[PDB]
Amino acid sequence: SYPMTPSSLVLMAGYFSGPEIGKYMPLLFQQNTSKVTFRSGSHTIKIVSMVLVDRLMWLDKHFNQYTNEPDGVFGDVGNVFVDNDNVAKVITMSGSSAPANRGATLMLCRATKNIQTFNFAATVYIPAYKVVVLNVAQWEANKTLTYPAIPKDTYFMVVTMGGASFTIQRYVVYNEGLELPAFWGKYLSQLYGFSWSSPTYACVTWEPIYA
Amino acid sequence: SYPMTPSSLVLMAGYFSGPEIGKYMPLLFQQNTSKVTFRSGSHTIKIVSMVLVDRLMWLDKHFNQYTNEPDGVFGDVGNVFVDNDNVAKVITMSGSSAPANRGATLMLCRATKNIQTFNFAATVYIPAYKVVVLNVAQWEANKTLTYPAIPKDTYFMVVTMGGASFTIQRYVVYNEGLELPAFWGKYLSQLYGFSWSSPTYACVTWEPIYA
């Protein structure tokens, strides 16, 4: 018995997959329309990445497996919308409150209903260090992006990013549609990086201190 | 009891660190001199990365921990030299034998003696996808690179890379001093990527099939 607490640093480990189009390619996207959005209060923001997880494991900083799950430990701070359907609850977020003019936020969601396949046009981007900054380099404009059906109770991650931010509880939520300070690579690791064909993880808790 | 076999896919997980100079920055280097080298038979090749691991764990593709260690399972296929001192044994290698004109090889070493601090000038590089290819972008020329003392029996990883290759058993060993095909990102994951401040892993076995 090793329960995660609301103070725990929790990793979402497993085999990550993004949208059918860059298989195994960690990618970001800028939707042409507002098809998938994080909503909370007055905020409606377009997400820039959606990632599903097979073989999910909740791990701590030392890769020891937690015996409970985030739903139940962390309270909901928002929702993910597909069009105007409220399809998922945002459970917790990862990122930094360190002051920055540009940044990104990770969000752990859980499908609240069975979610049906959806698709959308988007520009596809590859985030990569560039000589150092985190460069969001455009790959190809106007590609169709599909997501398979996501069952109920299925966890998944979304990302938002931009040069504006608002807060939800302590979470700093970046938004808008780019070069981010290299500082952000820690918060997007190990998820974004070279490959989703090999297993990886995303931190799902705020301000992860790996020290 | 879950022993790795010579047929096992084995991940080296832990907190990785490279040379004191890019803290937490996954980097490659091109030594100015032949200070650290992989040697085997007639081959003497300059390594392009050396990575130490704290909190090491041997994991399988599903992040289940092996109960034995690579030394003893895999046979030695070469050595790491610091100047002309034979300081480590290469136990196993990761990479691909898929035909390519440019590539990289990972090597799991084990210090065979207590190894003393060493330093060397090198150009420092950041490997990153570039719009797609794996670009080895130069950061800064002529930086001093230090490695702390490495005890005996300490595991560590070295990398070689280039547009030439030779084989040692089935291992394809890339060498010379760059744009690599994006195919290579899988084999360098999750090690290379955004951050070594968060825990990560390198595959230490040949032709990892994560499927």
Burial B68-105 (b: 16+ CB within 10 A, else e): ebbeebbeebbbbbbeeeebbbbbbbbbbeeebebbbb
Phi-psi category of B153—alpha, beta or left, where left has phi over 0 and alpha has psi -120 to 50?
left
Tokens of B67: 């109960």
Tokens of B22: 């890019």
Q: Is residue A146 part of a domain?
A: yes
Does any CB of chain A come closer than 8 Å to the CB of residue B131? Answer: yes
DSSP state, B46? Answer: E
| CA–CA separation, A13 and B198 (whole Å) | 13
Q: Is residue A3 part of a domain?
A: no
Helix (H, G, I), strand (E, B) or coil at A40: strand
| CA–CA separation, A146 and B64 (whole Å) | 32
Which of A 7-26 lie inside 8 A of B, CB atoms?
A: 13, 15, 24-25
Q: Is residue A4 part of a domain?
A: no
Decide: B15 and B30 in contact? Cβ < 8 Å. Answer: no
Residue B205's CB is within 10 A of a number of other CB atoms, namely 24
How was it solved? X-ray
> In chain B, which residues have their Cβ closer than 8 Å to the Cβ of A185?
193-195
DSSP state, B66? Answer: P
> In chain A, which residues have their Cβ closer than 8 Å to the Cβ of B197?
186, 189, 210
Q: List the resolution, Å.
A: 1.9
CA B92 to chain centre: 10
Q: Is residue A175 part of a domain?
A: yes
In the block, tokens 């991650």 appear at: A157
Q: Nearest 10 degrees: CA dihedral of B68, B70, B75, B79? A: -150
Does any CB of chain A come closer than 8 Å to the CB of residue B190? Answer: yes
Helix (H, G, I), strand (E, B) or coil at B185: helix
| CA–CA separation, A19 and A146 (whole Å) | 5
> Looking at the DSSP assignment, which residues form a beta bridge with residue B203?
B11
Q: How many residues does chain B have?
A: 211
Which of B 83-122 lie inside 8 A of A, CB atoms?
A: none
CA B49 to chain centre: 6
Residue A204's CB is within 10 A of a number of other CB atoms, namely 25
Q: How many CB pairs under 8 A join A and B?
A: 109
Q: Is residue A208 part of a domain?
A: no
| CA–CA separation, B131 and B137 (whole Å) | 13
Which residues are within 8 A (CB) of B119 and not within 5 positions of it... i.e. 6 or more apart? Answer: B144, B145, B146, B147
| CA–CA separation, A146 and A20 (whole Å) | 5
Minimum CA–CA partner of A13 in chain B: B63
Which residue, among B126, B107, B113, has the nearest Cα to B37 in the 3D structure? Answer: B107
Q: Is residue A20 part of a domain?
A: yes
Instruction: Check A199 against B57: CB less than 8 A apart.
Output: no
| CA–CA separation, B8 and B204 (whole Å) | 10
The CA-atom distances, in angstroms, between A182 and each of A125, A132, A185, B130 are 17, 6, 6, 16
Structurally, chain A folds into a number of domains equal to 1
| CA–CA separation, B210 and A14 (whole Å) | 11
| CA–CA separation, A198 and A187 (whole Å) | 19
| CA–CA separation, A173 and B169 (whole Å) | 51
User: Chain B interface, mutation test: which of A21, A25, A195, most B Cβ atoms within 10 Å?
Assistant: A195
The CA-atom distances, in angstroms, between A144 and each of A117, A140, A156, A161, B46 are 13, 11, 20, 21, 44
Q: Is residue B5 part of a domain?
A: no
Domain of residue B37 covers: 11-203
One-letter identity of residue A184: W
Strands B171-175 and B179-181: unpaired
Decide: B160 and B90 in contact? Cβ < 8 Å. Answer: no
Decide: A131 and A24 in contact? Cβ < 8 Å. Answer: no
The CA-atom distances, in angstroms, between A90 and each of A12, A109, A189 are 14, 4, 20
Q: Is residue A6 part of a domain?
A: no
Partner residue opposite A128 with nearest CB, options B62, B63, B130:
B130
> In chain A, which residues have their Cβ closer than 8 Å to the Cβ of B57?
63
